[PDB]
Write a protein that binds this ligand. Structure first.
Ligand SMILES: [Mg+2]
Lengths: 116, 111, 100, 53, 143
RNA sequence: GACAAUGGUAGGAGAGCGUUCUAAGGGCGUUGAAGCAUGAUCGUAAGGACAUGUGGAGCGCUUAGAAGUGAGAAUGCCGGU
RNA sequence: UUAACUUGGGAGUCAGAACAUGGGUGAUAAGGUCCGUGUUCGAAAGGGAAACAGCCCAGACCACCAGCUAAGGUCCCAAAAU
RNA sequence: GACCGAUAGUGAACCAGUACCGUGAGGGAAAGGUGAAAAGCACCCCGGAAGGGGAGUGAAAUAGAACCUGAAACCGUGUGCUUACAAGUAGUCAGAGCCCGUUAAUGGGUGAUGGCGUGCCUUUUGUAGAAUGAACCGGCGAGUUACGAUUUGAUGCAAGGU
């Protein structure tokens, strides 16, 4: 029996265009142009879940380095002592202590100089 | 309370109409009759003859006065073409698209 | 005050009356959980400060356990016929902090 | 020489910013009480009023 | 989750004036291009304007070691054909010492939508006075 | 519950969604079907529902059968712009 | 430590490229051309070499705003020792 | 009739080998649908007329002979956020400020500023390639059946099977 091409070329070419709303100009209207931007906007996102984890570490190290220099110590002298003086567990997301409570961040700097 | 009078499939183009309909939008209805009677284009008496039907269907059969009326929206959509050809040189032929237009004038009275 | 807990291979700065993403634990809803491993507990005046300090435990109370938003994972390569397409919902656990 | 690309709908609508007509520059014909185009006579009853035509 | 993002009404930016006498040219312009980007402070984030306004006085007494006074040249072009123009760092100290430091610093600033706004927190003066006494600066002992 | 594996074009092997039609068992439909339109929903993928609007008489589900069985490109072919 | 031979079902391929190292031909010429052994690209993403299939470190099951390291790096652009 | 349902099945569901092309033999398309019943819009009003808007027939004219449902491309009119010192394969991930309020879930629209980022196929030792192809949207458009051959999976019997 003749299988007529039914309502599957409606629906398959909506659920790509509806993913692609918010794009400039013709990249949200036409099929072929908004198709091949959806294939690249799920490829850019795949290397940006892997890059997000290592570019928020190029920021936490920047804040700690701009915290120990006012106590007159390097950064590389700060994550040396806190592995060697204490067994203060390696954490750099918890440079939130240096922002919030400067009185709390001062006693760590005391303990780092104490056994180095 | 608001009226309208739609004229459709007028022989004139759809881009040469909406230069004149751009000019009278949001203006008092007493002026806009007498702006279309001073411009020297080709679609001024055509638009004028349909503005004077939204100003007679707003006084008759709704019974509102024609001293307070204001043009709320006036827009020109597109009607079907008439594809005729033109015999061009070296045995070729090019297609000439005579387009037609729909004209809609809607007056209001601020209520 | 505040304290630093260690839950899912990573560390969370938490104070009081606070709700959190934590990756999946083994409790039903309406239960009570206990973090026996705290690191730097104390605000301005309260201090201990220690390598994996002992004695202080932090409680919690589970509000719901569910799944995050679907993160569609696509990857193609040009000039070839290669593609892949997946989808993922990382399961979490929402808590509420009752005592330090 | 032919176009190299299809000119878009952003570049098309920008080019006809300056493509329009201007207002006629009307007056009020003070004897009949109509509108007329200035420095012209009236198409109805109407004087020129510096010339009474 | 628990991270901080300092924004348009969560920071202040106070003033610094730096005596630029008796010290070399590119050893000075690193403790200025880091003050303008704001790496002396915690609550440093990208994508906003932290930092401090920096004023430079005594531009006339910066230094050079070796023959940079005669063999460092500043090529610029003018987009007409045959238009390259040369100027040396010995005649630039004497003629226009306000430009010499101001391009020793703006070569060290980032991608140039925000690095145009960071560079314009810098005031370079030739003598020993400055009309910015109404803004209350202080001396900054740079290393 | 331990310890293991999992980049991949030509190509070999496996496992599935969907479309029209027929047979059998059950079922919704003018107190509104198919189709179309909008939506912040569900599954590991193709794909499945449901909620108001338009629409005006026929359509899905479970097991098995049979194919004119799936379109982004062929200076592809007819129609529209 | 974990492959290897045997019998049968189904295709693909027969245009190869740089670098390293033994030699021919050319001029101890070419990103030249023709053979032996090894690697990478072919069919391989990622960090480095400013940009750059073939050079150096290393083989992506998906998620995380945790951790320790390789080639290479620590004034500033640009993470880390003026 | 496990055959087609208006680009299908005859070239042809419409008065088809007909408009139309050729001196001639010969080549050859395009077309379908109001409603259950024409009850197919009396009369007033702007108009030279077309075409409208009321009143009326009808279950509905937002089914009026451009007559069932009415997709996309493409042209319009309105409005919440936004843009006139900036070098853009137009996205992505981090994110202030503003206007909202869904299938209720660690929500939606918009995007000042920062990081990374040279379209898709086809042929290649190798393409962002300034090598090939497509203006865009919609339909149609390619490993099939027969009678044999051989191996594999099933099943019925088995010195006998058919
Ligand atoms: Mg080009």
């Amino acid at each position: 029996p003749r299988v007529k091409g039914g309502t599957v070329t409606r629906a398959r070419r909506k659920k790509t265009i509806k993913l692609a709303k918010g794009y400039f100009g013709s990249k949200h209207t036409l099929y072929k142009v908004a198709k091949q931007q959806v294939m690249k906007s799920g490829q850019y996102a795949f290397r940006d879940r892997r890059q997000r984890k290592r570019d928020f570490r190029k920021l936490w190290i920047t804040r700690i380095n701009a915290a120990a220099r006012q106590h007159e110590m390097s950064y590389s002298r700060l994550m040396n002592g806190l592995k060697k003086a204490g067994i203060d567990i390696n954490r750099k997301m918890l440079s939130e202590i240096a922002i919030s409570d400067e009185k709390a961040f001062a006693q760590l700097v005391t303990k780092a100089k104490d056994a180095l | 309370m608001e009226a309208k009078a739609v004229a459709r499939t007028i022989r004139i183009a759809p881009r040469k109409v909406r230069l004149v309909l751009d000019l009278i939008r949001g203006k008092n209805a007493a002026e806009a009759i007498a702006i279309l009677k001073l411009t020297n284009k080709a679609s001024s008496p055509v638009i004028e003859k349909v503005l004077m039907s939204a100003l007679a269907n707003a006084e008759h059969n709704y019974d509102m006065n024609t001293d307070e009326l204001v043009v709320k929206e006036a827009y020109a959509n597109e009607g079907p073409t008439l594809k005729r050809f033109r015999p061009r040189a070296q045995g070729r032929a090019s297609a000439i698209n005579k387009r037609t237009s729909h004209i809609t004038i809607v007056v209001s009275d601020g209520k | 005050m505040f304290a630093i807990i260690e839950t899912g291979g990573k560390q969370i700065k938490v104070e009081e009356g606070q709700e959190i993403f934590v990756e999946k634990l083994d409790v039903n809803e309406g239960d009570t959980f206990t973090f026996d491993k705290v690191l730097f507990v104390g605000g301005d005046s309260v201090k201990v400060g220690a390598p994996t300090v002992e004695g202080a435990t932090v409680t919690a109370t589970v509000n719901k356990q569910g799944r995050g938003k679907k993160i569609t994972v696509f990857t193609y390569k040009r000039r070839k016929n290669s593609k892949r397409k997946k989808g993922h919902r990382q399961p979490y656990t929402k808590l509420t902090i009752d005592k330090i | 020489a032919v176009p190299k690309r299809r000119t878009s709908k952003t570049r098309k609508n920008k080019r006809r910013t300056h493509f329009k007509i201007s207002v006629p520059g009307m007056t009020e014909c003070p004897n009949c009480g109509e509108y007329k185009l200035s420095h012209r006579v009236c198409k109805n009853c109407g004087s020129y009023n510096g010339e009474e035509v | 989750r628990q991270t901080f993002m300092a924004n348009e009404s969560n920071i202040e930016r106070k003033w610094y004036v730096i005596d630029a006498e008796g010290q070399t040219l590119g050893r000075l312009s690193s403790e200025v291009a880091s003050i303008l980007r704001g790496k002396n402070k915690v609550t440093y984030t990208p994508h906003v304007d932290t930092g401090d306004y920096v004023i430079v006085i005594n531009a006339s007494k910066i230094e050079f070691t070796g023959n940079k006074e005669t063999d460092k040249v500043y090529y610029r072009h003018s987009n007409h054909p045959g238009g390259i123009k040369s100027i040396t760092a010995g005649e630039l100290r004497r003629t226009n010492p306000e430009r010499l430091i101001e391009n020793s610093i703006k070569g060290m600033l980032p991608s140039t939508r925000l690095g145009e706004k960071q560079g314009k927190k810098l005031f370079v003066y030739g003598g020993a006075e400055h009309p910015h006494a109404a803004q209350q600066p202080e001396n900054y002992e740079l290393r």
